[PDB]
Design an enzyme around this catalytic site. Sequence first.
Site, PDB file in Angstrom:
ATOM      1  N   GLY A 144       0.806  -1.207   0.000  1.00  0.00           N
ATOM      2  CA  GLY A 144       0.000   0.000   0.000  1.00  0.00           C
ATOM      3  C   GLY A 144       0.841   1.260   0.000  1.00  0.00           C
ATOM      4  O   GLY A 144       1.940   1.283   0.554  1.00  0.00           O
ATOM      5  N   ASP A 177     -10.046   6.355   9.224  1.00  0.00           N
ATOM      6  CA  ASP A 177      -9.996   5.578   7.990  1.00  0.00           C
ATOM      7  C   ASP A 177     -10.509   4.153   8.201  1.00  0.00           C
ATOM      8  O   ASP A 177     -10.041   3.219   7.555  1.00  0.00           O
ATOM      9  CB  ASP A 177      -8.563   5.544   7.439  1.00  0.00           C
ATOM     10  CG  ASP A 177      -8.501   5.121   5.979  1.00  0.00           C
ATOM     11  OD1 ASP A 177      -9.320   5.614   5.176  1.00  0.00           O
ATOM     12  OD2 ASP A 177      -7.639   4.281   5.640  1.00  0.00           O
TER      13      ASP A 177
END
Length: 266
Positions: A18, A125
């Site tokens: 990521g 998030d």
Amino acid sequence: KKQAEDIKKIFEFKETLGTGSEVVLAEEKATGKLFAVKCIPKKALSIENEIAVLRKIKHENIVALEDIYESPNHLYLVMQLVSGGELFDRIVEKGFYTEKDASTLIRQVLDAVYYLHRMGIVHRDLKPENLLYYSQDEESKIMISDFGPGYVAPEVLAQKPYSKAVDCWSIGVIAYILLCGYPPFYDENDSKLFEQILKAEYEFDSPYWDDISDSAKDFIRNLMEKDPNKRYTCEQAARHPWIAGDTALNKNIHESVSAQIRKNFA
């Protein structure tokens, strides 16, 4: 093991996991053990004091901060690697899935976020992608995978001052998805979509929600509540009967939920 001249003396970087800083799959050359290493350029310049706090604390339902390395130009956060698989993958493959399963998942997320909130950390998030299983085992715990539109609280979309309560909204949205397999907000226009989010306009629509308990619906309503002051905290949600009691049902809802997951989160 703080200081390194070159991180490659320590780790063999394999696969990117990521980017945002970058997170890379890495093997410790001295042991062969695998980790997720978050690579942070020093240019992004309090932070060292905070990392120093969390390095000593392990929460059962949060990816562990195992080590920290400092290079001339980068900071490396060596994180626990979570190999159990993705949340939705498990549910679809299971062939059998109940409210109790969803409740068990949410209970763990509540535990994790409560701890983070206590430490003064707002996640901001929380989404299904950030929830991973510890192991391939049937009884594996779920874990928050990392921490610093449809999942974002109204007060955030409205550019208003916001607090830890925004995470609680996100948990509500995740709980919604875990019970029907589709997100509570979706539209082709971004006008009404944001407006629906801003107004907190969602429904437990038929037929998908027909076999879901009133208790689960009430649980979600308390978290997906427009007013952050009225919105349940993690502590309050963890006391709700759907989590703490026996109101989560035992009906197999896998068929519809998995069908909707495949359709919406393909």
